[PDB]
Design an enzyme around this catalytic site. Structure first.
Site, short mmCIF file in Angstrom:
data_model
loop_
_atom_site.label_atom_id
_atom_site.label_comp_id
_atom_site.label_asym_id
_atom_site.label_seq_id
_atom_site.Cartn_x
_atom_site.Cartn_y
_atom_site.Cartn_z
N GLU A 1 -2.19 -5.02 13.34
CA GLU A 1 -1.10 -4.57 14.19
C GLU A 1 0.07 -5.53 14.19
OE1 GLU A 1 0.53 -2.29 16.01
OE2 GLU A 1 -0.75 -1.03 14.75
N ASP B 1 -3.37 4.93 10.71
CA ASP B 1 -2.06 4.89 10.06
C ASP B 1 -1.77 6.05 9.12
OD1 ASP B 1 -1.27 2.13 11.20
OD2 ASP B 1 -3.20 1.74 10.23
#
Ligand SMILES: [Zn+2]
Ligand SMILES: [Zn+2]
Lengths: 218, 216
Positions: free
Chosen positions: B53, B146
């Protein structure tokens, strides 16, 4: 029926009929219209595939050179091998994704200091990208992708070979189905077509493993 | 909702129930047997997710930079943000998987020339593997991994955000569910557990309007 091409790193590289007929249709479709790069891509792709299934090979030899041939089926490429240890998998599995990943990360850097422009498309650059996907995609913890043999490995000695198999295999089936639901829902053949490969690719694993277990459990 | 942890570089970092439930399962699993490992992993994972992240973040600041929050899941992060410049999607999305990928490939090599053994468990090696899966896993076209922020993008232009979000998010919930039936039907907690992260991950991404509060 395969056709000899040439041997690299001491491993026979062949081209399956399915691959040839498939290539022929491509070469032909690269002339019926001006889909120039489409043909070249297919070539780069499989060249890259070769290398990926080569690294896979190498790390394997250093365990038992059951590697006879290597024929390219239109759906990627398969390295004809024999018995594969249960304590060498984890390595032989990641082996291929490393190769195609490294190769991709290198050609990526270099394709920013130099490359070849064909109608614009930078071959070097393009490739790195593919290798990167081929590297990274073959890591989704599922079957038949390498990340499936890998996930099984990490698990195996803790959930027992069959259950640890089933988990990977199950997720494939999981992904595939969903993929289907939307390929079938947006009527996008390729999505569908791929969803089937993956899925029956996962199932073909449960079957054999499972059958086997039963046979071992007498 | 989640539970505050701490902030960095001016961005609130939270922990979704997803991670608390996962924590809970691990704490319990460390009492089922004389663990060290299950606790170890939770830490390694967590650390690895943070890095994942972070990559997502960097490439983002070199663009819209609109980073207001960061929710962490054992799967990945639902870094809540706003406007996403053109080409920030495609990039910011794969940004994280690459970090997770490279970090994993590096530590993997290294962990064959050197490692750290904690009651046996080889930290580096272990790690590499998590980042590799954490990298590879987030490539599944669904939420919140993602591969969803990216599927939304490629899709967006032909369906528009509001419902184009639903699509990806829907794909998640659907995927999740099926996976659940499997985990449930084969009594394989893992499937089950992930099945949940995924789902509530879509429930938390498929949002569009959020009214919060603040006490500074
Ligand atoms: Zn492979
Ligand atoms: Zn992410």
């Amino acid at each position: 029926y395969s056709i000899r091409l040439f041997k690299i790193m001491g491993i026979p590289i062949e081209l399956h009929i399915t691959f040839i007929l498939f290539l022929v249709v491509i070469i032909g479709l690269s002339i019926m219209n001006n889909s120039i790069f489409w043909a070249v891509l297919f070539i780069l792709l499989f060249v890259s595939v070769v290398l990926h299934e080569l690294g896979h090979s190498y790390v394997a030899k250093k365990y038992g050179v059951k590697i006879e041939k290597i024929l390219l089926l239109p759906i990627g490429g398969v390295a004809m091998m024999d018995k594969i240890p249960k304590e060498g998998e984890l390595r032989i599995g990641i082996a291929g994704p490393l190769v195609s990943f490294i190769i991709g990360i290198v050609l990526l850097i270099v394709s920013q200091f130099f490359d070849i422009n064909i109608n614009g498309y930078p071959l070097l650059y393009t490739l790195s990208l593919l290798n990167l996907m081929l590297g990274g995609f073959n890591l989704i913890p599922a079957f038949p992708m390498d990340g499936g043999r890998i996930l099984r490995a990490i698990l195996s000695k803790k959930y027992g070979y069959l259950k640890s198999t089933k988990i990977a295999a199950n997720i494939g089936k999981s992904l595939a189905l969903i993929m289907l639901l939307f390929g079938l829902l947006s009527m996008n053949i390729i999505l569908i077509l791929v969803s089937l490969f993956v899925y029956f690719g996962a199932e073909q694993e449960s079957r054999v493993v499972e059958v086997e277990t039963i046979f071992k459990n007498i």
